[PDB]
Subunit: 157 residues, 6 copies
């Protein structure tokens, strides 16, 4: 059972770690796929995001961090993934998640979308807000792995 | 991995069959657990709902149908399940799901709640709606397993 | 074009009057159909709700008030209606509406469900809320047609 | 400023304690008003719910617990309150809140409805869920004040 | 009865065709109005969008495809439209649709907003996602009229 | 009791006036804080927005209009505010408001978020839509204070 957990992870947060950890307990191998070509230019580059994610999940043996470009479904297919991990926060855009799941099912029926729920601790935060806050002189240490915290300070300095 | 798909299944519809089927393709064994749910004054008795579900899933070798009146978390632990399956078809079916999911996580942290999405075909139906239509002699053959439709027909009028 | 505005109308409020009025300006004939809805244990009998609605819409020459206990789709077909009217005032009043709408489309595909939006003035009221307030002797004259308020006053205390 | 926190509190949970506490830090005096709510067939009698709330808030010197069967707006006016407190933990708990809020504003315009947000810890619980879990002998000590848990234990089984 | 169905239609999809077709069955004349001056620059130009829409609705006799600039309400007024067609997908932003409907009612009270529901087949897809997917090497043939499909390939080539 | 009511107020609307007025009736001093460095470039400059807001709230004695940059929470802290005013429209993005409230609670626990509800009159409009409409030759006089109306005409001229 190969599962894929795609996203921009710009940067990876404790919420992401929470989700991927829960996934590794259900599936044999989990590919943490980092989107290589966003439309929004990232705060961190693909290479940086991959490095941060690799370090943050170094302790997770069955987790593989890999960057990818173009369509996520095409990458999942080539990686032979049959499970698509999606984190559902309390503040998630449910309607959007439904569009995404149905579109991905259309593109690759053999890839089953599964939604996991993070701890209440990370159920109300998003990478978008974390960056915004950090960029505006706010403390977001609590939401990030130590390595990501150190990298973010250098990035905003 | 042993997964438990809990619900009232009063009656089990094609929507439920859709969800349990996706579950069996993902996990080794799936226990479709039917709760007594007396506070809901079910149309069919627990024994009836169990028989209907057993027949409706006879073709699924990895599905085991069982009834229970225990606390969901205790039953899951006692059934040796570590994954809890629930279907998501609408926003309303999200806030309520998070409460149960977090409550179950509190009672049994190792029980991971997984949410699956049904086919577009069954995204707008529920046991409740099917029963209401049937109570008015409307054709619901399209939404129920054969044995269940017969049972529902016989149960009414 | 013949349109049918179905509901329990227990009792019909100014919100309903608002919707049916917008309906008459759009379609040639509008049938305000009151469902028996026994499972809801209506405050007023079907006969009472029909009389209240008839009086409350006496000024609307294109509105016909009728009661029914049949399957909504069959009644619509038998009334020669091809448009089904429903009001939308909130998100909750959307997911539930889509289920009925898709179920009715399944039973009678030529019956097109149309959703209208009430005035801001009636966007937060419902028959249920009005009754609850009235049960506590609160002033609800503002939300109900004159004849309906009298009837509600008489019905209670 | 005198504020009134109305609800059924059947039973009062740690979530309610969280909300009322935030209320006392904001307003001089807070009246936790427990509605009879007979249509809800409360588990505990009004007298019982009042006693449970009184004990659960004994440490809060600015909180006054009272029971009422009157129209919420009239009781608020008669209690000389000008602020109405309500907690928000989910979307569902928003559309329903706006209806009551606008209805109360109609009955008593000077009564300003204020919405507070509970801690993440209590964002997914409700009296209803706690009771359902307790009816199945599940451990709910974590979500209820000590005296309330004892009372709930004694009330059941 | 003249109805207007406004949008950017960039490009027109099967969901749009579904909605406009349902509209032509209720109203005498339907103006498929294509927004001429978006803020987001279109994938296809206004002229292209009009050509694609005209071809895709060539079989619909009472449909008129027309481009317009500035305020939709001002165009509707000059076109003497009294019905404003809005498609409501399951994944629609309901709150936004309410803002839009109320703003348009403020601008032109004589223009009544009517919401139609597409088939379940097109209830979870948006032009936004279709473009995104196509632009990233995904197959979206299923969601577009043949002529639109051919035009999109040339556009992305 | 010092409360802060932050926002971009670009420009200030009747909805904003409604909310700040309700706030001044509950708290001793209200700081209407205008965001100085948005990401979206404003229609009106910070200086203009402050001037417009000052004029529009000139009649409100306990209201202080002040511009601020960087993190709102840091400004609130330095201003010694303990109440954070948030307006909740019927068309509000509730999930987003929850993210914001929780993030701000993390940043400054002593700042309590309180949500107020505007009149039904302003419950379905946003500054975003008002600007869009005005920019496209639509009448938005009804939603703005006279001074803001005059300033907007000059701005778009
Ligand atoms: C049956 C169900 C899964 C709900 O499913 P439903 O929406 O199909 O009725 C839930 O009510 C349940 O778990 N019941 C058993 C009693 C219990 O433990 N309840 C607390 C659940 S958190
Ligand atoms: C009465 C109503 C329109 C619902 O309206 P309501 O929200 O006003 O109670 C619906 O329950 C109905 O159509 N009842 C008739 C029985 C039926 O056919 N039910 C299936 C509807 S899909
Ligand atoms: C008790 C409550 C505050 C609702 O709270 P709840 O969600 O905790 O049950 C409401 O039902 C109420 O105000 N009841 C008193 C009767 C009344 O005036 N109802 C109309 C309220 S608009």
């Amino acid at each position: 059972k190969r599962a894929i957990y795609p996203g921009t992870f710009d940067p990876i947060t404790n919420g992401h770690i929470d989700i991927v950890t829960r996934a590794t307990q259900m599936f044999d191998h989990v590919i943490l796929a980092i989107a290589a070509s966003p439309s929004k230019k990232p705060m961190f580059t693909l290479e940086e995001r991959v490095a941060l994610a690799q370090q943050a999940t170094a302790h997770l043996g069955n987790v593989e961090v890999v960057g990818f470009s173009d369509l996520m479904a095409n990458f999942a297919r080539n990686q032979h993934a049959t499970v698509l991990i999606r984190g559902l926060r309390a503040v998630a855009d449910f309607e959007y998640e439904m569009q995404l799941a149905h579109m991905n099912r259309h593109l690759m029926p053999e890839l089953e979308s599964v939604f996991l729920m993070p701890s209440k601790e990370w159920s109300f935060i998003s990478s978008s807000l974390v960056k915004e806050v950090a960029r505006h002189q706010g403390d977001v240490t609590h939401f990030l792995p130590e390595n990501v915290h150190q990298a973010l300070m250098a990035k905003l300095a």
